[PDB]
Design a protein around this ligand. Sequence first.
Ligand SMILES: CCOc1cc(CNC(=O)c2c(OC)cc(O)c3c2OC2=CC(O)=C(C(C)=O)C(=O)[C@]23C)c2ccccc2c1
Lengths: 258, 10
Amino acid sequence: PESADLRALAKHLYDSYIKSFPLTKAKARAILTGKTTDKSPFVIYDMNSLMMGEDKISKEVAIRIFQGCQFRSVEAVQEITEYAKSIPGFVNLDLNDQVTLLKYGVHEIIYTMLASLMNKDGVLISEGQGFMTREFLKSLRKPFGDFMEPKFEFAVKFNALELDDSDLAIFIAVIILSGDRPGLLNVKPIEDIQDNLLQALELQLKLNHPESSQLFAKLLQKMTDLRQIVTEHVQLLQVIKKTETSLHPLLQEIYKDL
Amino acid sequence: SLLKKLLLAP
Ligand SMILES: CCOc1cc(CNC(=O)c2c(OC)cc(O)c3c2OC2=CC(O)=C(C(C)=O)C(=O)[C@]23C)c2ccccc2c1
């Protein structure tokens, strides 16, 4: 019955993930590999193709693309918030603790979910209607090319784990319910929720990836790696803010005193 | 805050 309840929890999380996140890894892989009747994405691989694809998806291109990433991130933060509110126990936490969990969690989840839409060659954008190449993004002038590339670097390593949406739903939940985020007021209720989510994740991986005993331990390490990854992202965004002569208010709020 | 507003919206 305990294991049965952990599977029920896994399924609840998956169902909530499907309601919260329009752009699933399943749907993204169907597009990337070509197994879809739907329209093929418009490929953007240089300045010329970017200009042509404007409708399918005075400021210079690098800035235009950076603002695009910002607006998608804003949309993603809202999706992640909705998903967080579906995790059993989350909305009953102290509201300021809920804020803290999102503040420190959202960019780790954004990196995770971005991987679902990436391969080694590029990233799906605009609900899969566009595909922008990694090479085009990396070639953008300093400091914007180096802002893009680490997201692909992480995706390549993370996608090697071959997680599916059912695995990801639980992985994301575990990350959000991290009891060691700076400034949390009531730690134990968060830790108790996370302990149960971790049990659900372990069972999920044992059943869904029986030939990969190492996967749970590897995912625990990825959660640790993501903190370092996001600290570097935030540093780079602080650099851009001071060295480039705009930042969305929601993102400004998240980065402030992070 | 904006996060708080997002959290409170049913
Ligand atoms: C964690 C920081 O957020 C991110 C987010 C993304 C996701 N990016 C995109 O989805 C993404 C993108 O992407 C190139 C380029 C791009 O041009 C756009 C993107 O999404 C957009 C939303 C818009 O509202 C646009 C406009 C004009 O209004 C855009 O133009 C879009 C279509 C990243 C994608 C690749 C590499 C790093 C990334 C970092």
